[PDB]
Amino acid sequence: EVKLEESGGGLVQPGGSLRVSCATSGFTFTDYYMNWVRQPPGKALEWLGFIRNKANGYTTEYSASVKGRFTISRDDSQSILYLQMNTLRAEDSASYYCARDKGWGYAMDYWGQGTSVTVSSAKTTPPSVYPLAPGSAAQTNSMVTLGCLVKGYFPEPVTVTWNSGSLSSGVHTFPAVLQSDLYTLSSSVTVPSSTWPSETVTCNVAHPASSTKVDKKIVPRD
Amino acid sequence: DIVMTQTPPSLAVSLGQRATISCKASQSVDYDADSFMHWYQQKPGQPPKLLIYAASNLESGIPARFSGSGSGTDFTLNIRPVEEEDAATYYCQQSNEDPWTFGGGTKLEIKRADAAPTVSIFPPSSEQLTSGGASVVCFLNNFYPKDINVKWKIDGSERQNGVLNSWTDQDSKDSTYSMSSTLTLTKDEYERHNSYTCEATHKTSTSPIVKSFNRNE
Amino acid sequence: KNLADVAGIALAKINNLIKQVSAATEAEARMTLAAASTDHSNISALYAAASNIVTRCVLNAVHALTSLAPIALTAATNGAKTSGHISEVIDILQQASTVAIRQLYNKIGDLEKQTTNNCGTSVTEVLEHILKQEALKEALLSIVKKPKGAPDKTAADELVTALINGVVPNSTAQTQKLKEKILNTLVPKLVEG
């Protein structure tokens, strides 16, 4: 039904600018107030501002942390919401959420998936993707666990799927760890021993900031 | 300029029991008898979901297990009975005075029966060795509670440096945790030794779960 | 002197009640003009509920004044004086040139008892009191309700805006925020059905 998506996130240099946008469908965009909310990694939600509808003058409210640097605007013809960010700082790095207001600057009843912004002077590094196959020390058991290691990328996030999403249960993707200004994560998957290695198992790693899509097949070791 | 204080910061509740999370406002967020306090649920990596608006109104589509109460400066959110899907962080928000502010959040953990981890170890891939690095990876999957200790032993002696651990958030379906432990060495240091073991000590057993491999096969 | 202290308190209350009747009747005047200029069945029913509230502010404030003035006059001058416009006597008493004071102090404590039930001292203030009342909210929701589907939220916006332009013609940031606050307090009832 109601759908809001966020787009435009990426890596920005300190002091730079970025515009994120929110495409909405499934409701009469013109009748609703719209909000922007952000959440820095590992921190609390933070309200940024809202924009009024046509009936109430298209005016805006902002939090003080963002007043003067950010500008919220909307396009009623295309039912799209914008947030324009200027003079970005490192602590502006967060996931930015577009959220529809339930009233007139009230509660937020619908939220988008969010778009990620990283403000940093380090540059984009594509990940190294290594397959993790059993060492054949504990050869047999009915369920076998495979993995793949995603090392040395920047910025977050990366997406990991197994067999193009067809293998979704029994998957654990672990949160990235930052060392030396590069992130590393790993992902495990467990499959029946009757299905590997007789059938193929591939982990698919996507890093939008580098526009890279990488597939690694898990082949038995050596 | 209203500050929101949630208590407790962390809470563990058994299935079927009651969870109570409280928000205390630095000044009143009410307008006469009408409240401007709202509650949100956020599962890890997902967008927040509105549960209760104006202190006590249950938003459409939200199960009756959630309820809110309070007035003026003190409010509570109630979950009865608690279910596995409730593993999440909960936020209060006030829209009484500009700017709107959020509480710091309360993480709810759902208790379950103790479960031992499933452990598997992986040698460095040949693709990574060519670049000069060597990562040994140990997965510890689907255990509870979250507290766990991993030791690495190279040729029988404990190694403390180059070890990085990462926990998943509590699973929404089975209420377990998983963790990955990565020991990264140089290719030169890796090829100097033969036997590599990760040892997991968890409340479910006094003896550790040990998985290992030998580098020459 | 103790009479010069209470005389100052009585005159401050009399001046405040006089400004209450001025603000409330000024709201009523703009509402009656706004009701006569426009020919809609719906918005006129709002002015009916609003006028009944504003007039009753005036009746209450005048009732308090006419009760307080003879009381203040007896205290300021113990010699028999019970007439209106005592403003001159307590004012000069307050500057220069006990039973009745006790009588007065109680009436002032009695008056503030009803300080919570007092509409504004300005036209913006009385307007805020109008929208806070259940009688106006009850009238507004009955107009926007539909028998089948949900009550119309866009019409509630329009009716409150027209009312706000009846009482306060020049829009302010406070008027906009006041309009949003009242409409927000009704959000639970505009989603029923």
Alpha-carbon distance B164 to A179, whole Å? 10
Q: Give yes or no for a contact between C135 and C36, defined as CB atoms under 8 angstroms apart.
A: no
- Indicate whether B37 and B86 sit together in one domain: yes
| DSSP structural state of residue B146 | S
Given 3-state DSSP classes, what are the helix, strand and coil percentages for chain B, each rounded to the nearest 5?
Answer: 5, 50, 40
Alpha-carbon distance A176 to B165, whole Å? 10
Q: Do C185 and B31 touch (CB under 8 A)?
A: yes
Q: Give yes or no for a contact between B148 and B179, defined as CB atoms under 8 angstroms apart.
A: yes
Alpha-carbon distance A218 to B15, whole Å? 39
Q: Do B128 and A130 touch (CB under 8 A)?
A: yes
CA within 13 Å, CB half, C149: 3
Say how many C-beta atoms besides its own lie within 10 A of residue A196's C-beta.
20
- Indicate whether A24 and A109 sit together in one domain: yes
Of B92, B112, B132, the last residue of a domain is: B112
Query: Can you give the residue range of the structural domain that contains B81?
Result: 1-112
Which residue from B161, B148, B18, B168 is spatially nearest to B81, judged by alpha carbons? B18
Pairing of strands A108-111, A94-101: antiparallel
Alpha-carbon distance B76 to B25, whole Å? 11
| DSSP structural state of residue B60 | T
- Indicate whether A163 and A75 sit together in one domain: no
Q: Which residues in chain B have Cβ-Cβ distances shorter than 8 Å to C191?
A: 60
Tell me how far CA of residue B128 lies from CA of B183, B184, B185, in angstroms. 13, 11, 11
- Indicate whether A35 and A140 sit together in one domain: no
- Indicate whether B85 and B135 sit together in one domain: no
Say how many C-beta atoms besides its own lie within 10 A of residue B1's C-beta.
9
> Coil, helix or strand for C163?
helix
- Indicate whether B71 and B130 sit together in one domain: no
Pairing of strands B133-143, B149-154: unpaired
Please indicate the experimental technique that yielded this structure. X-ray
Of A94, A121, A148, the last residue of a domain is: A121
State the nearest Cα–Cα gap between C187 and chain A, in angstroms.
7
- Indicate whether B160 and B213 sit together in one domain: yes
Query: Can you give the residue range of the structural domain that contains A144?
Result: 122-220
Token pair 């608006």 in the structure block, residue: B53
Alpha-carbon distance A193 to A199, whole Å? 10
Q: Give yes or no for a contact between A33 and A50, defined as CB atoms under 8 angstroms apart.
A: yes
Taking any CB pair shorter than 8 Å as contact, residues of chain A touching chain C are 31, 55-57, 59, 102-106
- Indicate whether A3 and A103 sit together in one domain: yes
Of B73, B96, B112, the last residue of a domain is: B112
- Indicate whether A126 and A115 sit together in one domain: no
Token pair 């009640």 in the structure block, residue: C17
Total tally of structural domains belonging to chain B: 2
Say how many C-beta atoms besides its own lie within 10 A of residue B21's C-beta.
23
- Indicate whether A87 and A108 sit together in one domain: yes
- Indicate whether A19 and A36 sit together in one domain: yes
Residues 6+ apart with CB under 8 A from A190: A143, A144, A145, A146, A170, B141
- Indicate whether A164 and A75 sit together in one domain: no
Token pair 């009342």 in the structure block, residue: C133
Alpha-carbon distance B39 to B50, whole Å? 6
Q: Which H helix or E strand runs over B94?
A: strand B88-94
Q: Which residues in chain B have Cβ-Cβ distances shorter than 8 Å to C187?
A: 53-54
Q: Give yes or no for a contact between C19 and C120, defined as CB atoms under 8 angstroms apart.
A: no
Q: Which residues in chain B have Cβ-Cβ distances shorter than 8 Å to C185?
A: 31, 34, 54
Token pair 């001159």 in the structure block, residue: C88
Which residue from C123, C139, C119 is spatially nearest to C60, judged by alpha carbons? C119
- Indicate whether A24 and A106 sit together in one domain: yes
Of A82, A105, A121, the last residue of a domain is: A121
Token pair 């990991």 in the structure block, residue: A160
C 148-177 near A (Cβ less than 8 A): 153-154, 157-158, 161, 176
Alpha-carbon distance A188 to A143, whole Å? 13
- Indicate whether B104 and B66 sit together in one domain: yes
- Indicate whether B215 and B156 sit together in one domain: yes
Here the tokens at position B128 are 């990574």
Q: Do C191 and B60 touch (CB under 8 A)?
A: yes
Alpha-carbon distance B88 to A195, whole Å? 34
Q: Minimal Cα distance from A109: which residue of B? A: B50
Say how many C-beta atoms besides its own lie within 10 A of residue B67's C-beta.
16
Resolution of the coordinates in A? Answer: 2.3
Pairing of strands B34-35, A159-162: unpaired
Rg over CA atoms, chain B: 23
State the nearest Cα–Cα gap between B73 and chain A, in angstroms.
18
Q: Which H helix or E strand runs over C29?
A: helix C2-37
CATH code (residue B122): 2.60.40.10
Of B91, B112, B133, the last residue of a domain is: B112
- Indicate whether B118 and B94 sit together in one domain: no
Q: Which residues in chain B have Cβ-Cβ distances shorter than 8 Å to C132?
A: 32
Alpha-carbon distance C93 to C4, whole Å? 6
- Indicate whether A168 and A102 sit together in one domain: no
Residues 6+ apart with CB under 8 A from A34: A22, A50, A51, A72, A74, A81, A98, A99, A100, A101
Of A121, A152, A173, the last residue of a domain is: A121
Q: Minimal Cα distance from B123: which residue of A? A: A135
Q: Give yes or no for a contact between A186 and B180, defined as CB atoms under 8 angstroms apart.
A: yes
Say how many C-beta atoms besides its own lie within 10 A of residue C36's C-beta.
10
- Indicate whether B21 and B121 sit together in one domain: no
Q: After which residues is chain B broken (C to N over 2.5 A)?
A: none
Total tally of structural domains belonging to chain A: 2
Token pair 């290695």 in the structure block, residue: A197
Q: Give yes or no for a contact between B79 and B65, defined as CB atoms under 8 angstroms apart.
A: yes
Token pair 């082949």 in the structure block, residue: A219
Strands (E), B115-202: 118-122, 133-143, 149-154, 157-159, 163-167, 177-186, 195-201
3-state secondary structure chain A: CCEEEEECCCEECCCCCEEEEEEEECCCHHHCCEEEEEECCCCCCEEEEEECCHHHCCCEEECCCCCCCEEEEEECCCCEEEEEECCCCHHHCEEEEEEEECCCCCCEEEECCCEEEEECCCCCECCEEEEECCCCCCCCCCEEEEEEEEEEEECCCCEEEEHHHCECCCEEECCCEEECCEEEEEEEEEEECCCCCCCCCEEEEEEHHHCEEEEEECCCCC
> Coil, helix or strand for C89?
helix
- Indicate whether B85 and B183 sit together in one domain: no
Q: Do B31 and C188 touch (CB under 8 A)?
A: no
Alpha-carbon distance C175 to C171, whole Å? 6
- Indicate whether B118 and B106 sit together in one domain: no
Q: Give yes or no for a contact between B121 and B136, defined as CB atoms under 8 angstroms apart.
A: yes
Pairing of strands A182-192, A143-153: antiparallel
- B113 burial level (CB within 10 Å; 0-12, 13-18, 19+): exposed
| CB proximity A64 to B under 8 Å | yes
Here the tokens at position C71 are 């009381």
Name the residue among C181, C188, C191 with its Cβ closest to that of B31: C181
Name the residue among C154, C158, C180 with its Cβ closest to that of A105: C180
Here the tokens at position A195 are 């299905």
Q: Which residues in chain C have Cβ-Cβ distances shorter than 8 Å to B34?
A: 185
Q: Give yes or no for a contact between A15 and A92, defined as CB atoms under 8 angstroms apart.
A: no
Alpha-carbon distance A203 to B153, whole Å? 29
Q: Which H helix or E strand runs over C21?
A: helix C2-37
b/e per residue C4-22 (b: at least 16 CB within 10 A): eebbeebbebbeebeebbe
CATH code (residue A182): 2.60.40.10
CA within 13 Å, CB half, C7: 23
Say how many C-beta atoms besides its own lie within 10 A of residue C193's C-beta.
10
Which residue from A173, A44, A24 is spatially nearest to B48, judged by alpha carbons? A44
Name the residue among A56, A102, A103 with its Cβ closest to that of C176: A56
Q: Give yes or no for a contact between B75 and B23, defined as CB atoms under 8 angstroms apart.
A: yes
Beta bridge partners of B75: B23, B70
- Indicate whether B107 and B3 sit together in one domain: yes
Q: What angle do CA A174, A131, B167 make, to 5 degrees?
A: 15
